[PDB]
Design a protein around this nucleic acid. Structure first.
Ligand SMILES: [Ag+]
Ligand SMILES: [Mg+2]
Ligand SMILES: [Zn+2]
Lengths: 127, 473, 157, 49, 97, 54, 150, 128
DNA sequence: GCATCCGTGACAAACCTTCCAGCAAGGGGAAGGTCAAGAAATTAAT
DNA sequence: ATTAATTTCTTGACCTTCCCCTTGCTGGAAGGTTTATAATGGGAGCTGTCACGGATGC
């Protein structure tokens, strides 16, 4: 019921969940009156939910906003749906700017395979 | 000051001496060369490592002279505080001072009329003693075994009070008497008429009248708190080979504080009597091996299979602090050189190499170069010395005349084995000694390594010229 | 680190028994599954420091402690120049017959306890920092010329 | 190896052989000392040895 | 082999010995008794206090000789207080008058 | 302090510690060990003013 | 920081560094005098707190003593003479400068040329024994001597 | 030439170029006797090249290699070509990861709209 | 009141907690360092 | 005994590092806790060290 054996079962590391415990990401478990910490099965479910959220490519702020509305009987799934829609809109804006860099750059670097001549038309055009 | 006063160390005196207490056996850190909090070399207890430079690097460069950094307790001052800061190891149990226990004479039995066999029986945790009893059978200073302690427990109960070890003899020395026992021994010395008793009772009553007259107490004879040696005096310094240069007394102090921490861990964990009596016995043996390693038992070894130096081996014979570092000491301006023959000189005149007088008279060379205007600063004159300018030989000939120097054979045979000489400047790398005084040296020319000592001030210069020159005797 | 260096000593003994030659840090690093700089770092801190009473000579007359260099060194440089440069500044800056010497002696800490910046010396005299900076630059232009501060120029060594 | 390297180089019998002359080498190899373990010491000896 | 203010120690603040270590010859105790048999007090007060012992004394002596003042300025020796703190740590009270 | 330099420094140092032997430094080696001027030779005239002004 | 072996040393003249290379080591055959630097081995020192007079001196002139410290082991004074060999050793994983590379190349050239001359004179003696056997058995002054030894 | 108008030319501040100086990808500039950084025309070309990639065309790990090969000064127009082919391979793996994430979000994130029916188990279905 | 026994001189191996530095890729606050404007202090007409 | 063109002083107005910090891990270092067959009197000089007193036992 400790944290590192549960991390090894779920496939996580102890440093990640300890960094989640350092900030306001995972709910703080009760102290087991020793140098260890016990876990509720709901805490393990929240841990593997946050691991599934971080492994697919969500930022940790929005996954923290997902796990704040986890393990509670309210569970509103409309405003957090709009927040995840804005998150993937920002992700698609990042995709758009990186593909803009991709089709901006890739038509200038054909020749000059590594000769000792000090003449290149890429850097003088870019700068 | 004009007098040296010695006494016995009170625990309140050590508490005033301390200015910081040590509780952990750490000396320094092993990666960084910085001692951490509350250690054997720590900055809060003893002081910082460099001149005006704190531990973490927050307060330095003369900005904070008397404030204390709240992060680690370091007082930002010079390195000179590292040679005067004391100890105060918080001992959980009182222990036996082996200098006042296993000496010849022991000075703790002659204060009590107890033989040294019984002292070994009580200080080693084997036999009990009773301080006072309700009946005359359990009188003062009675030596009881553990079966006799059990018999007195089932016979008396709460009437008697018999502990074991250093605490029992500590309470016995503390609560015996102060002057009534001295008056009773003074009247019973001349009350009885004998000779074998009047050769030890007079020494006992002289010891007791010294205790009452000097203001000392027998509680201060036993050791209840141990102060450590200053850590600059036992320096854990990194040598230039990769490893470290430590002292074995650091290892003994680490073992003493380790046994003290084990005792402190044994008091709160409700230890049985065997382990805590063996812990106090081992603390007694550890402080015995720290004070005088060759008295209580086998000399404690180290990693190189050698008897480690105790506090008594630091002052003992020619290898002690007295005859190697205090009485007979190495000195600056002392040039080891062989003896040669100068026959073209006067009786008060000796030879001197220009290289040895160049390196030996360096403050005189720098002062004469600055006072003549031939050199601007000190390091410019040093570069003139290191490059061997023509004018520095002339200024060395100017400063070497009317300036006596002390020639000295090692080891000297008598008083005329060392006397002063007015040197001249020649070539070579040896001292041309006048041949008439070699019989006063009893130093034939066998390559004898003569030390040449320079008197610095005009008091010592005129003392060399007018009193211990060879023209004076 | 005691456990890792004990495992390293056991692996070094095993490679001694398997090879015969002295164990290089490369085989111990690849068998320890650790980088080599950490292996040499834990190898550096190998054992207890040589005590002070080991007979490094031929007899029992000179033990250790008579060979240690001083960490708090007092060279002819560090003893002579640390006072002669102070006397030279006390002689030269006394010729500065205005408040530039009085604001420069506390600019660096000469004949003062606490080193002050331009703000702390400003509140005493000249609260605008750039006035003290300009008088410091004027004193620098007076002192950098090799005409009278040549005795201060010779102290660069 | 600790024993055969403590005896070779750090014992009282092992010392620096003066290789200045061949005579010094062959009189240091044919040198019968009595120091170290088992033998006497220079300070604890009499006129008999 | 001579020595003039270079590479001191750390234990008792002492000059070293040997040419490879750059330390002067030992002024032993028999030389102390012979120098005291002469009655030389100022040379012995230099040879054990201000030439080798006191770290704040030998620097003041060097600064005095460099500036030309050859005046004997003694002080507290930095290895007598070594013995003082050694016997104070030993468990024996001692102080000055 | 001169007796604690010859031999058995442990024994005579314990005898000095338990008796409170306050040294006046009258002897000649007693000022060698403390590091002051000796009361012998040229230092005798200094000790003539030292012991009178005390 | 680890102790580098370089040539740019402060608080010293160019004539003292005249007999050194870019690595600071003397060339083979350098007639050094007592007091000069044989190997320029400076250490990176910590930022020790300076006296305010030296701080004023650093503020006035361009004397900027950085972390490099003049701790190179010089020649002991009074000992003259030349150099006969400069043995360089290094730890694994550490790169080599040009002086250690040229000393390793000199040692490789020595162990190549001396062993090659040893093998050449050994081959000459073995072929002299072969020629002695050939003239002991028969005699051919043209087929054996005029034909090359390989 | 103190870098303030140079910082307005290159489009950055003193902190970012100071962090570039503290890293092992920028040549050490000149200090004009006061601790201020001086940048020449070749240094201005290097600064505009690194700012024309980090804010515009690349990240730090590739613009550092570009400004390292720019001070050779023998430039190569095909080493940068295989470098940007590896870079577009890395970012096409990145965008296929993000499009798989978007497809998984649209597959297992559809729920009921805003009404009086709370407690949706879609977060529990995303937990697994 | 006498013979006889010790100091002391001797040129393993995993298991879990807190605490702190690095590389992203840098912005900002605190604290200390240099440039163009108007004000003190000098001189050439009476 | 006067003041008008230079030459300094002073004041905003700008210019750098130092250090803490930004989300998100990632690694390293210091300290404490179990592990569950059977494990029960351990270990090491070195004397080839000789001649004194000071305390112990007849
Ligand atoms: Ag090209
Ligand atoms: Mg002789
Ligand atoms: Zn600190």
């Amino acid at each position: 019921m400790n944290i590192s054996d549960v991390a090894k079962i779920t496939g996580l590391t102890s440093k990640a969940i300890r960094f989640y415990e350092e900030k306001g990401l995972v709910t703080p478990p009760m102290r087991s009156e020793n140098g260890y910490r016990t876990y509720t099965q709901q805490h393990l479910n929240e841990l593997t939910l946050l691991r599934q959220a971080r492994q697919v490519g969500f930022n940790l702020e929005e996954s923290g906003e997902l796990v704040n509305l986890f393990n509670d009987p309210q569970r509103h799934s409309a405003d957090v749906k709009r927040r995840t829609l804005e998150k993937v809109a920002e992700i698609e804006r990042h995709i758009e700017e990186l593909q803009s860099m991709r089709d901006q750059l890739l038509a200038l670097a054909n020749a000059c395979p590594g000769d000792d001549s000090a003449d290149c038309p890429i850097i003088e055009n870019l700068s | 000051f004009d007098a040296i006063k010695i006494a016995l160390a009170s625990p309140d005196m050590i508490r005033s001496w301390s200015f910081g207490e040590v509780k952990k056996p750490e000396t320094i850190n092993y990666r960084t060369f910085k001692p951490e909090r509350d250690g054997l070399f720590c900055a809060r207890i003893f002081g910082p490592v460099k001149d005006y430079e704190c531990l973490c690097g927050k307060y330095k460069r003369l900005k904070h002279r008397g404030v204390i950094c709240e992060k680690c307790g370091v007082e930002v001052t010079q390195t000179k505080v590292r040679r005067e800061r004391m100890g105060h190891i918080e001992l959980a149990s009182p222990t036996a001072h082996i200098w006042f226990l296993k000496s010849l004479p022991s000075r703790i039995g002659l204060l009590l009329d107890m033989p040294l066999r019984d002292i070994e029986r009580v200080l080693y945790f084997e036999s009990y003693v009773v301080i006072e009893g309700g009946m005359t059978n359990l009188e003062r200073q009675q030596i009881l075994t553990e079966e006799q302690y059990l018999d007195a427990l089932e016979e008396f109960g709460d009437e008697f009070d018999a502990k074991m070890g250093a605490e029992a003899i500590q309470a016995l020395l503390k609560s015996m008497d102060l002057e009534q026992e001295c008056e009773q021994l003074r009247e019973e010395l001349n009350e009885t008429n004998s000779e074998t008793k009047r050769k030890k009772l007079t020494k006992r009553i002289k010891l007791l009248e010294a205790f009452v007259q000097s203001g000392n107490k027998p509680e201060w004879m036993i050791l209840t708190v141990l102060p450590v040696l200053p850590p600059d005096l036992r320096p854990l310094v990194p040598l230039d080979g990769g490893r470290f240069a430590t002292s074995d007394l650091n290892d003994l102090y680490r073992r003493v504080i380790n046994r003290n921490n084990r005792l402190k861990r044994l008091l709160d964990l409700a230890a049985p009597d065997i382990i805590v009596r063996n812990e106090k016995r081992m603390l007694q043996e550890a402080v015995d091996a720290l004070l005088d390693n060759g008295r209580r038992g086998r000399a404690i070894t180290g990693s190189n299979k050698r008897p480690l130096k105790s506090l008594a081996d630091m002052i003992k014979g020619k290898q002690g602090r007295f005859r190697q570092n205090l009485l007979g000491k190495r000195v600056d301006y002392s040039g080891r050189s062989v003896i040669t023959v100068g026959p073209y000189l006067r009786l008060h005149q000796c030879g001197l190499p220009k290289k040895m007088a160049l390196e030996l008279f360096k403050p005189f060379i720098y002062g004469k170069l600055e006072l003549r205007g031939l050199a601007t600063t000190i390091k410019a004159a040093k570069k003139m010395v290191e490059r061997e300018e023509a004018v520095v030989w002339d200024i060395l000939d100017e400063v070497i005349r009317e300036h006596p120097v002390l020639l000295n054979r090692a080891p000297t045979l008598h008083r005329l084995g060392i006397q002063a000489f007015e040197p001249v400047l020649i070539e070579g790398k040896a001292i041309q000694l006048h041949p008439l005084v070699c019989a006063a040296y009893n130093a034939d020319f066998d390559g004898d390594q003569m030390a040449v000592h320079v008197p610095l001030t005009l008091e010592a210069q005129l003392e060399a010229r007018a009193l211990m020159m060879s023209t004076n005797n | 680190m005691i456990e890792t260096i004990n495992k390293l000593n056991r692996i070094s003994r095993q490679m001694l028994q398997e090879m015969g030659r002295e164990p290089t840090p490369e085989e111990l690093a690849e068998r320890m599954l650790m980088p080599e700089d950490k292996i040499r770092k834990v190898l550096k801190i190998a054992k207890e420091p040589i005590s002070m009473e080991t007979p490094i000579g031929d007899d029992e007359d000179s033990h250790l402690g008579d060979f240690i260099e001083d960490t708090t060194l007092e060279l002819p440089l560090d003893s002579a120049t640390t006072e002669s440069l102070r006397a030279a500044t006390h002689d030269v800056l006394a010729g500065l017959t205005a408040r530039e010497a009085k604001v420069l002696r506390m600019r660096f800490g000469i004949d003062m306890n606490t080193d002050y910046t331009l703000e702390e010396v400003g509140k005493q005299f000249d609260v605008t920092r750039e006035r003290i900076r300009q008088i410091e630059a004027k004193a620098l232009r007076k002192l950098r010329h090799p005409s009278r501060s040549e005795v201060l120029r010779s102290f660069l060594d | 190896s600790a024993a055969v390297k403590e005896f070779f180089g750090s014992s009282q019998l092992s010392q620096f052989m003066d290789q200045n002359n061949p005579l010094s080498e062959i009189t240091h190899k044919r040198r019968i000392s009595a120091l170290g373990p088992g033998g006497l010491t220079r300070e604890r000896a009499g006129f008999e040895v | 082999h001579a020595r003039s203010t270079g590479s001191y120690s750390l234990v008792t603040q002492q000059p070293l010995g040997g040419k490879a270590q750059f330390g002067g010859q030992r002024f032993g105790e028999m030389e102390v008794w012979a120098l005291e048999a002469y009655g030389a007090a100022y040379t012995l007060q230099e040879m054990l206090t201000v030439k080798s012992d006191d770290v704040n004394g030998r620097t003041k002596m060097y600064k005095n000789i460099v500036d030309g003042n050859h005046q004997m300025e003694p002080g507290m020796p930095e290895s007598f207080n070594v013995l003082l703190k050694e016997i104070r740590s030993l468990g024996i009270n001692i102080e000055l008058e | 302090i001169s007796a604690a330099s010859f031999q058995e420094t442990t024994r005579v140092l314990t005898e000095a510690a338990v008796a409170g032997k306050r040294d006046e430094l009258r002897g000649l080696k007693e000022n060698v060990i403390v590091g002051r001027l000796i009361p012998a030779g040229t230092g005798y005239a200094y000790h003539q003013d030292r012991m009178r002004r005390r | 920081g680890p102790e580098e072996i370089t040539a740019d040393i402060p608080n010293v003249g160019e004539a003292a560094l005249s007999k050194l290379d870019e690595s600071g080591i003397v060339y083979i055959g350098a007639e050094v005098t007592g007091g000069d630097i044989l190997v320029g081995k400076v250490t990176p020192k910590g930022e020790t707190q300076l006296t305010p007079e030296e701080k004023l001196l650093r503020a006035i002139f361009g004397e900027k003593a950085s972390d490099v410290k003049d701790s190179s082991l010089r020649v002991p004074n009074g000992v003259s003479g030349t150099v006969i060999d400069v043995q360089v050793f290094t730890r694994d994983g550490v790169e080599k400068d040009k002086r250690a590379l040229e000393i390793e190349e000199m040692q490789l050239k020595q162990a190549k040329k001396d062993l090659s001359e040893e093998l050449q004179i050994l081959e000459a003696g073995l072929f002299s024994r072969i020629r002695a056997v050939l003239v002991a058995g028969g005699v051919e002054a043209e087929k054996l001597d005029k034909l090359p030894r390989d």
